[PDB]
Amino acid sequence: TIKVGINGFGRIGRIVFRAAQKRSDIEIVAINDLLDADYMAYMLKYDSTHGRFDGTVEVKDGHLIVNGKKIRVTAERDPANLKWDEVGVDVVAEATGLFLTDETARKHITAGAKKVVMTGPSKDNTPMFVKGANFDKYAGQDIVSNASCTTNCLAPLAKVINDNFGIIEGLMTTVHATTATQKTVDGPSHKDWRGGRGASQNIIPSSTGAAKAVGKVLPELNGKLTGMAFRVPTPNVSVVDLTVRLEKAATYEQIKAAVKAAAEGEMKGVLGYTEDDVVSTDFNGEVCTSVFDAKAGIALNDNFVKLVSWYDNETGYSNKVLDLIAHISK
Amino acid sequence: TIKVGINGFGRIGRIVFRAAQKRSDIEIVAINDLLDADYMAYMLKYDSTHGRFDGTVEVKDGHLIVNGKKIRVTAERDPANLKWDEVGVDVVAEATGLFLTDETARKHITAGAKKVVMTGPSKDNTPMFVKGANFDKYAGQDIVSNASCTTNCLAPLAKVINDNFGIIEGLMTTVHATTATQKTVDGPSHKDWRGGRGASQNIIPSSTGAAKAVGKVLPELNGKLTGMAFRVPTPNVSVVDLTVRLEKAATYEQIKAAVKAAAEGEMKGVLGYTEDDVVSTDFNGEVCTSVFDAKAGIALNDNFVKLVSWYDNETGYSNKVLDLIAHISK
Amino acid sequence: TIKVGINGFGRIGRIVFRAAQKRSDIEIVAINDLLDADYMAYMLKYDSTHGRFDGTVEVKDGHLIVNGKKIRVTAERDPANLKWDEVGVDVVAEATGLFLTDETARKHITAGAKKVVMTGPSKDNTPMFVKGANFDKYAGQDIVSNASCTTNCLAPLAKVINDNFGIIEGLMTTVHATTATQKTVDGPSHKDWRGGRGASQNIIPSSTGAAKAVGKVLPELNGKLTGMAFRVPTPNVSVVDLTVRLEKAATYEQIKAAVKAAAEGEMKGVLGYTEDDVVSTDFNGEVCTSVFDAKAGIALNDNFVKLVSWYDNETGYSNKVLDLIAHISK
Amino acid sequence: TIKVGINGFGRIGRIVFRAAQKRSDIEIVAINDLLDADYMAYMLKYDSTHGRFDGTVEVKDGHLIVNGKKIRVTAERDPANLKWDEVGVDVVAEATGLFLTDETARKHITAGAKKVVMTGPSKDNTPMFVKGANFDKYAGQDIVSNASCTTNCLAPLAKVINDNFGIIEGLMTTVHATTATQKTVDGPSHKDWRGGRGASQNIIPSSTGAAKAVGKVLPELNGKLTGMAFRVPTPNVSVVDLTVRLEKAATYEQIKAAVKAAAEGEMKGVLGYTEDDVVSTDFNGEVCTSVFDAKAGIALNDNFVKLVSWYDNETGYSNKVLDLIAHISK
Ligand SMILES: NC(=O)c1ccc[n+]([C@@H]2O[C@H](COP(=O)([O-])OP(=O)(O)OC[C@H]3O[C@@H](n4cnc5c(N)ncnc54)[C@H](O)[C@@H]3O)[C@@H](O)[C@H]2O)c1
Ligand SMILES: NC(=O)c1ccc[n+]([C@@H]2O[C@H](COP(=O)([O-])OP(=O)(O)OC[C@H]3O[C@@H](n4cnc5c(N)ncnc54)[C@H](O)[C@@H]3O)[C@@H](O)[C@H]2O)c1
Ligand SMILES: NC(=O)c1ccc[n+]([C@@H]2O[C@H](COP(=O)([O-])OP(=O)(O)OC[C@H]3O[C@@H](n4cnc5c(N)ncnc54)[C@H](O)[C@@H]3O)[C@@H](O)[C@H]2O)c1
Numbered sequence A, B, C, D: 001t002i003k004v005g006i007n008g009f010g011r012i013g014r015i016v017f018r019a020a021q022k023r024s025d026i027e028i029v030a031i032n033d034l035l036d037a038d039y040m041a042y043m044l045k046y047d048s049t050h051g052r053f054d055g056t057v058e059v060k061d062g063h064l065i066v067n068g069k070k071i072r073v074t075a076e077r078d079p080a081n082l083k084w085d086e087v088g089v090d091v092v093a094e095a096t097g098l099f100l101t102d103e104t105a106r107k108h109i110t111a112g113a114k115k116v117v118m119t120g121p122s123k124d125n126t127p128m129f130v131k132g133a134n135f136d137k138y139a140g141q142d143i144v145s146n147a148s149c150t151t152n153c154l155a156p157l158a159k160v161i162n163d164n165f166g167i168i169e170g171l172m173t174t175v176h177a178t179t180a181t182q183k184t185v186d187g188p189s190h191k192d193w194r195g196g197r198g199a200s201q202n203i204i205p206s207s208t209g210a211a212k213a214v215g216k217v218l219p220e221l222n223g224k225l226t227g228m229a230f231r232v233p234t235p236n237v238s239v240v241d242l243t244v245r246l247e248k249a250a251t252y253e254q255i256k257a258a259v260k261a262a263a264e265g266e267m268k269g270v271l272g273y274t275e276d277d278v279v280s281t282d283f284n285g286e287v288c289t290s291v292f293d294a295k296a297g298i299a300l301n302d303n304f305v306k307l308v309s310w311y312d313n314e315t316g317y318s319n320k321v322l323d324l325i326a327h328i329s330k
């Protein structure tokens, strides 16, 4: 049993919590956000996207009792005041989206935690890991990042394609679901003007470093990929549209065979494969971080192809956050 | 020319600004928010709901030049530091949604303004006015409130019905468009748990004092009305569903005749009337604050009827804010 | 087990099929629609609203094999040519929405079925039964109707209120989710002009006979209720807003006490009760046909109140279709 | 003036009608569809996407009177029985989407019309013309096609890029608004299974021949482009995402310079250029068929870039249908 403490009970914090209930090796013993225990119990119980929590949630004496287990609840705005050691926290899932550098996240280690896993791309040199891409390179570091949802989708796919055919260069577009940082109606978003426009009314272009980041987890692809994003009016589930130029010519059939083989072997549980007429909602709740859509992709010729891969930006990522926690715990 | 200064360039501040361009008696000479002049120019220029601004917008030396006219731009968080007198501001349209009491709004008068019009229901005893209901009671007060969008819809209708048939009692439901206070995905809303749930995914019940407030503008209806609201996934335009018990029996035809007559006489420009098969988008940009939908209403009997009335929560209200400004300016 | 055959594998037909899987007493043995087995398998497997089918579905020799059981598949456009004889069908869930009269629905009896349950309100005098309102009135009829989803929500609530406090008169509004009947963009809808307007962009007023239909399942309420609907931009789950005038004075606390009592007693499984800050998505998958929202309702006085009740228009109703099938087969 | 007759008063037929009102050279004198004059008047008057018709529309003796001009109204399901002779129709805007071949469309010539413009891509070899790409190639043909909305967006852009830097190969994706073809809720769509899934709930992968179709209006690009689409939850306005490999090295600044030059010169009115932080709604009502988004695009290197261009799939295209009508009538 690895004892985890969650900082930031948001979309990711809550989905990591629900995913943890199905794992015997990991156990959440404390949660911090800036909310009351009864309000947190409410956000755990009901979810517009994923449905009602299956289990019991009761608030007793300012703490949560979920399925019998007692969970310490705090509302400390500063991580240094979390006292993770009081509850015996081994690893902390840093999910606020505010402490993405070694110095801010290190506060949890000062507070008594042993290791920290950021649930977003680090903003400094903190190493990023993506399952299926470079977990094996982990060298015992105490602060680590699980990268972004888009990088978790792109990397495993990019790896299989490169290994078999060699990527000369590629450009990616992610059609992404609306997130907590957007607005309901045209509002202020000083650092992202487009991002402040009404989410339900618009297709909103957005820049993203998720493609370039693949170079950090798969060094051999460094400098060969980049891309952008379009935010669209759906509440969850996104898709990667990767246009790549191949070194070795490969028919679309050969590409499908390579992906399927990896989906069934080395990357089972990370990379998925499908030939069904799927749409985004079909992946709501999906745990695989990259699901190759065989019928959506199209090849101009044997060396220039467009590949499509689905990912539940909330669920797949959250499950891999747990995987990384177990991994770094040996 | 009445010189107006806008505090809070939000949905209401921006729509009041655009409506003012079509009025010769009123002129905006200054705007305050917590944004840069170039960002404000951007929010003025493009609107997801109402389209591009028709006119020229240029940012010169930290100020706006709209259709030739220079408009002072400030970003003072505290109203007491606005120096409205420097630009000769007569009336201020208080549109931040934060200064709804005499003492907070009075800061604008300290800052050099002569009168203040709140664009929301006052939270204290500041008098509320609704065009078609009680503008004639205005007695020279310096701080005034234009009430809420729902009250502006309900009051003129309630008045005509009461005058002709006498309201014994009534309960109102407003199916309302999503607003800036809601969330894109399930998030924190400590003072309104339902209001924090994903806006595009849900029908969200909400309490509202808009019905009871009709009693403040039409004292004779005090204690006879109340209601609630359902927030739905549309970006603009709302509708009042009023269930009333009548003193004098009246056929639905008689009710239509009374409303139409008022729409064409005493309440022209405030109360509208229609017999078309309309839907919400048909009122996007509507200036009348209450548009009676003759075909949507239904009568159980001559003394118990359900009446339906549309209102563009942004445009109708903004236009009446301007009307009140002119009214109080004599 | 009762062998059931489904005619019309649409939204209701499909949800009835899923619900039946969780019942030991009912068993679906044949399905009819105008689609190939492969397409039917795909529609069962994937659902945008309810998620992926919980089980295995294969196609073998033009027939479905769901969870190992063979299910005869057909494409007869005429009920008479269905041969329910062969497959041993006892009751038919008539879900096409085309045969809502004895004349047409009786073709299933001709075709070998013993009884028929229409999944919509009968257009002739075929008796309608609503669980919680009049199942006890069933008198051996071979063709019955399960009324509509809205009536299934309103009846159980209206009975509890009437029985305890006496409903003098009431007017209802249902804020309803979008249905297959609507258009994605402004299109032709000859029968109902408002209904052809873009579903996602509008609040669309609509007529409904659901309130009057209550008078047929609860005669004591005949002529005392009527209402209308507002179709809004959500994919599933609706809510009734009932404004009633009470004979016996009752405080909101007493109304709550009565409803809660019925929910835990005589109407267990039909009428639910909640005091949480729920929103529409919290009922997606809900089995009870009427879930009373304690906190959403509001009373003007002891004899005039607004009551709010939720219902998953697809799931609750479908489970009740199965309940009626069990009932008329006792 | 050119007297035009419209066949198919759908989205395109209606928007072509509105656009024609703003043109002195074209004049609509007759409309045909399978709807009554009253219903047609209602559909013209109210539009969920484009607002209320700017003018007067009356029905008199089963015919429309728009802005004082009489417009013959008909309901012939067969083109041959249209008698365009009587009304003096020169060109027919064939917008039903049913007659996309010479064989079928020629019935209008039989019926008295001089020429025909199909508002969709021809299914046979009827030549296609795209303003900005090959209008200059028109050689007197009496039946021509205006291609599709997507091709109208892609062609002008592809020509400017190819002419200046040489396109070796390209792969495109169009993130497209919802169309009348889609379903509001999971429904039957035999031809395209993904297309029957709930439009509002999903990102739906789709095929498109628009990229290949570029090869027919710009032969030099035949076999060098192909692509796909993603249908998303918005009512109007789409965007092409073009990933191309350049023969001649060009920096993004040089690509911008070339596009801006074409927008202000040879392609004025067809191809637009912008550097603002625009989103989809900013193009609702846009006349240019391809608006280059300078800031959204991204280059990996001097020979591999992603270009982004916006288009109001209804308005731009409709204005171009009028341009082609003017062109083939010179
Ligand atoms: N939403 C996704 O699809 C997704 C996927 C992968 C990674 N992420 C990343 O994970 C992080 C969280 O994103 P989210 O979508 O879950 O956001 P969110 O806004 O839903 O969650 C943020 C939570 O942190 C809480 N919080 C804010 N300040 C806090 C503080 N000082 N101390 C403790 N708690 C605080 C908030 O109250 C909130 O509940 C971000 O880095 C985001 O980029 C998001
Ligand atoms: N949206 C509607 O339909 C509607 C209709 C009628 C009345 N109202 C009311 O009007 C008010 C504004 O609502 P809105 O929807 O326009 O909101 P909004 O959030 O769109 O506008 C608020 C604006 O005020 C600015 N602001 C915040 N703090 C400020 C400060 N201290 N100083 C200056 N500017 C500041 C914000 O940056 C923002 O641009 C509220 O009282 C609201 O209830 C809204
Ligand atoms: N969906 C709801 O919210 C709801 C709730 C309660 C009752 N109902 C009722 O259920 C019935 C169907 O509604 P729905 O929502 O399932 O609609 P739907 O359009 O999804 O289902 C209709 C199905 O019937 C099939 N069909 C059509 N003609 C057929 C024929 N001649 N023979 C066999 N199959 C045929 C169609 O292929 C389609 O799959 C209606 O009476 C409706 O009023 C719907």
Ligand SMILES: NC(=O)c1ccc[n+]([C@@H]2O[C@H](COP(=O)([O-])OP(=O)(O)OC[C@H]3O[C@@H](n4cnc5c(N)ncnc54)[C@H](O)[C@@H]3O)[C@@H](O)[C@H]2O)c1
Binding pocket: C187, C188, D007, D008, D009, D010, D011, D012, D013, D032, D033, D034, D076, D077, D078, D095, D096, D097, D098, D119, D120, D121, D148, D149, D179, D180, D313, D314, D317
């Ligand atoms: N809407 C877009 O985004 C778009 C863009 C470019 C091209 N188009 C094309 O325009 C054509 C129509 O598309 P739409 O979007 O206008 O669809 P739509 O369904 O809105 O319009 C079709 C219209 O044709 C009418 N109609 C059907 N049969 C008829 C008949 N036999 N005789 C007369 N009228 C008949 C229908 O009543 C309907 O009003 C198609 O070829 C489509 O590909 C559409």
